[PDB]
Amino acid sequence: HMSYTWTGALITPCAAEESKLPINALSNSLLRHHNMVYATTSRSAGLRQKKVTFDRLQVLDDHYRDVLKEMKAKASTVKAKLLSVEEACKLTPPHSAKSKFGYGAKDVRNLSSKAVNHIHSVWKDLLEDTVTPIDTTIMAKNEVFCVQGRKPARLIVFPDLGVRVCEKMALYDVVSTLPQVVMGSSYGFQYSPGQRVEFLVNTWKSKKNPMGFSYDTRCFDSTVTENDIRVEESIYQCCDLAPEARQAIKSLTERLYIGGPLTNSKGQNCGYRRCRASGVLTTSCGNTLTCYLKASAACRAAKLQDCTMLVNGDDLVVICESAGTQEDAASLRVFTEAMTRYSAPPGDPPQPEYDLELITSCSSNVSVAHDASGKRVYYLTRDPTTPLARAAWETARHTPVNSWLGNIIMYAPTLWARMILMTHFFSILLAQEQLEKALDCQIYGACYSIEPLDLPQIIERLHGLSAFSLHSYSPGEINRVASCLRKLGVPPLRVWRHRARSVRARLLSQGGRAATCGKYLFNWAVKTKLKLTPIPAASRLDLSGWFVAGYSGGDIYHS
Numbered sequence: 115h116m117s118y119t120w121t122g123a124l125i126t127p128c129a130a131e132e133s134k135l136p137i138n139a140l141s142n143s144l145l146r147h148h149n150m151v152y153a154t155t156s157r158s159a160g161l162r163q164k165k166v167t168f169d170r171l172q173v174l175d176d177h178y179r180d181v182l183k184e185m186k187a188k189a190s191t192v193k194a195k196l197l198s199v200e201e202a203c204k205l206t207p208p209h210s211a212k213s214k215f216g217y218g219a220k221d222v223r224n225l226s227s228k229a230v231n232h233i234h235s236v237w238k239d240l241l242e243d244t245v246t247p248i249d250t251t252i253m254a255k256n257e258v259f260c261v262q263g264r265k266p267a268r269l270i271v272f273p274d275l276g277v278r279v280c281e282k283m284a285l286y287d288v289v290s291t292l293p294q295v296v297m298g299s300s301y302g303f304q305y306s307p308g309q310r311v312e313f314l315v316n317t318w319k320s321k322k323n324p325m326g327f328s329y330d331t332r333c334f335d336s337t338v339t340e341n342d343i344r345v346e347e348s349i350y351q352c353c354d355l356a357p358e359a360r361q362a363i364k365s366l367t368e369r370l371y372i373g374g375p376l377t378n379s380k381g382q383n384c385g386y387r388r389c390r391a392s393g394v395l396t397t398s399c400g401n402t403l404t405c406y407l408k409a410s411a412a413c414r415a416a417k418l419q420d421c422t423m424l425v426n427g428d429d430l431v432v433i434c435e436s437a438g439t440q441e442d443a444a445s446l447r448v449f450t451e452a453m454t455r456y457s458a459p460p461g462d463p464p465q466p467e468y469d470l471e472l473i474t475s476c477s478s479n480v481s482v483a484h485d486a487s488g489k490r491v492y493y494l495t496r497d498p499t500t501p502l503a504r505a506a507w508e509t510a511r512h513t514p515v516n517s518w519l520g521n522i523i524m525y526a527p528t529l530w531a532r533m534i535l536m537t538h539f540f541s542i543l544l545a546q547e548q549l550e551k552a553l554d555c556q557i558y559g560a561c562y563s564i565e566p567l568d569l570p571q572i573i574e575r576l577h578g579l580s581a582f583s584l585h586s587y588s589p590g591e592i593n594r595v596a597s598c599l600r601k602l603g604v605p606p607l608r609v610w611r612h613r614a615r616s617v618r619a620r621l622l623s624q625g626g627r628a629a630t631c632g633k634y635l636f637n638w639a640v641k642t643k644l645k646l647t648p649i650p651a652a653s654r655l656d657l658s659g660w661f662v663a664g665y666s667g668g669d670i671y672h673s
């Protein structure tokens with residue numbers, strides 16, 4: 115029962131790959147220690163292949179079937195609809211991988227006859243044939259990291275453009291609607307960061323003696339079995355669906371989700387997958403359900419008292435009622451034993467935490483600062499090393515995903531996003547006159563095209579106005595940022611405050627939406643602080659399509 119089999123054909127690139135941080139005139143204003151930053155390339159793919167290739171054994175007990183029955187009872191209340199071809203096409207990202215059959219993502223977006231005719235033919239074939247495995251492409255992802263020594267490239271596996279549009283037709287409503295019905299408040303992808311921090315704090319405060327822990331599954335996608343994927347299909351099929359949608363979903367499950375052949379960029383056969391594909395629509399929903407199913411069942415096994423789970427795909431955090439520190443630790447071993455029997459064994463062994471701030475989930479921890487009134491406010495933050503490593507790369511190279519922008523949006527209230535990322539990138543945008551130019555970033559796996567001038571209103575909506583007023587950050591948080599800057603050779607925060615005053619004056623000069631950016635984003639930079647009030651255009655923002663579901667690998671775009 116192996117996750118993959120390989121033919122020995124190489125995982126090959128589709129363009130030149132850089133591994134060394136590209137340096138330009140702007141690089142040194144952010145980061146001096148250039149040799150610390152690197153991009154993964156397909157040269158390391160063989161190391162990743164070894165890591166993701168193993169045997170899966172699963173033993174499923176009454177706890178598992180008990181939780182599953184209940185999940186299915188909730189799934190049976192969901193009514194999901196088929197998307198039209200037009201609706202599915204309009205969710206396709208403009209720069210999505212072109213089809214092997216002679217059209218691209220813009221042909222799809224424009225509903226071009228050739229595109230739409232192909233999509234119709236893939237759909238018909240899905241309904242007519244429920245056995246023939248569907249071809250996928252396996253690619254090495256190029257991602258930027260700081261050394262620690264160097265990690266191998268991650269692998270993405272995805273079907274052709276035509277199939278991706280059919281997935282949407284069949285499953286977009288389901289993967290968007292089902293998970294919150296099944297899991298309720300435990301489905302993480304429904305929350306803004308403000309909502310998520312609130313849920314975490316409220317949940318913590320709701321226990322008499324809280325204990326909390328995160329669970330890291332080693333290579334979760336490879337731990338996912340044919341059983342797991344058929345189980346997911348059986349949850350989908352509990353929904354009230356049109357007969358045509360039922361067939362499409364059974365077919366995609368048999369032919370695509372369960373497994374299939376892997377083809378490299380040069381068209382050669384690299385092997386065969388029998389685990390979760392990283393690049394399908396159901397990757398996030400399937401991972402979330404399957405992780406929640408397994409963990410709920412393991413919580414029962416361990417007899418964890420008054421558990422609340424929070425699950426984003428394969429990222430899992432649990433907060434419960436402590437039974438004492440020794441009992442807690444023992445319960446955790448049992449928990450991990452159960453997860454392992456279910457095929458989800460750990461990377462790091464989990465550990466019990468008695469302080470919310472010491473838990474990492476979605477790569478983030480709770481911390482505390484103060485608003486203008488002096489009131490405590492909790493916010494989500496993280497070690498800034500990877501964010502700043504990538505910011506350094508994106509200073510000198512244009513990338514398909516601007517991580518700096520997703521980091522500003524999602525970590526707006528943080529010391530490091532406000533002082534460094536905002537200051538640095540607005541300074542660049544000013545200089546090139548690109549404040550109004552829409553950029554793409556990825557939030558919960560979906561692709562959004564966002565104008566930098568819109569950030570204040572986006573930030574108010576996700577975080578509230580306090581994001582623009584926070585101060586007296588904790589010593590532990592100040593210290594971690596200061597350490598990171600010393601590690602990467604980033605100028606100290608006193609330097610960034612100086613530049614921010616400049617960037618702010620520059621933005622104020624321009625008036626309009628630029629001055630709003632100066633006024634709200636950089637109020638921290640001046641001693642005589644302005645009074646920040648709700649931004650009118652914020653209540654006007656269409657944050658529909660934001661924070662409904664997760665869509666990692668799912669080829670979803672919002673305009």
Ligand SMILES: CC(C)(C)[C@H]1C(O)=C(C2=NS(=O)(=O)c3c(CNS(C)(=O)=O)cccc32)C(=O)N1Cc1ccc(F)cc1
Nearest residue numbers: 306307310398401426427428429476520524557558559666
């Ligand atoms: C923009 C961002 C900084 C990268 C943001 C985000 O979009 C993800 C995130 N994107 S994802 O790939 O869909 C995903 C999976 C996907 N796992 S899977 C493959 O199993 O679907 C599992 C867990 C998280 C995420 C994330 O963790 N972030 C930090 C953050 C999270 C919540 C906050 F409130 C604040 C910050």
